[PDB]
Design a protein around this ligand. Sequence first.
Ligand SMILES: [Fe+3]
Length: 216
Amino acid sequence: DQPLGELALSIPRASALFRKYDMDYAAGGKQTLARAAARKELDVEVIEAELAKLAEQPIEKDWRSAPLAEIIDHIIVRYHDRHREQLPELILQATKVERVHADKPSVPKGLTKYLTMLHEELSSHMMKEEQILFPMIKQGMGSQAMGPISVMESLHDEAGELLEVIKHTTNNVTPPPEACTTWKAMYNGINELIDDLMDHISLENNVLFPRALAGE
Ligand SMILES: [Fe+3]
């Protein structure tokens, strides 16, 4: 029906269920809903019914037409700053569960290192965005940003690669019945991150970058 990006950016709370399990409306945002419902054996399109259910909600803030400077400032305060505060704690929660519940079978061994790699990668990527690309866009130089953007999108793909590993390491970030408090809450912080981290890349890859390259 509609592109994955515009579907999550028009509907106030589609992004949530529109993520469900294995829905990539971020880096592959311009992909059509038919494709996301093609390779992934989804219902023919009752999704649209799900979309129509919450399509009645009023309009909040359609970033599609918002100024690029507001989009940037929004990402810096809502997503960039958030990740820098979430991942350090997850690294500490991972190394505790990997140590405390090591005797368990379903322990997500290696979770602490994959989280650390994602933390290393992201921090490097955001710093580049905030010091190289975002300032370039605010000055109105978006048309010449093919190089810098094309470089950041490659780093977006490396980030997703790490999310899938973290997903697989945690059995689709789903804890077992033996999960104590420091094991369940952690998986919640992981789900919180993927949400904030999918919407983060969705806004950068489907709105900021194309409009900037479009000279808007
Ligand atoms: Fe970013």
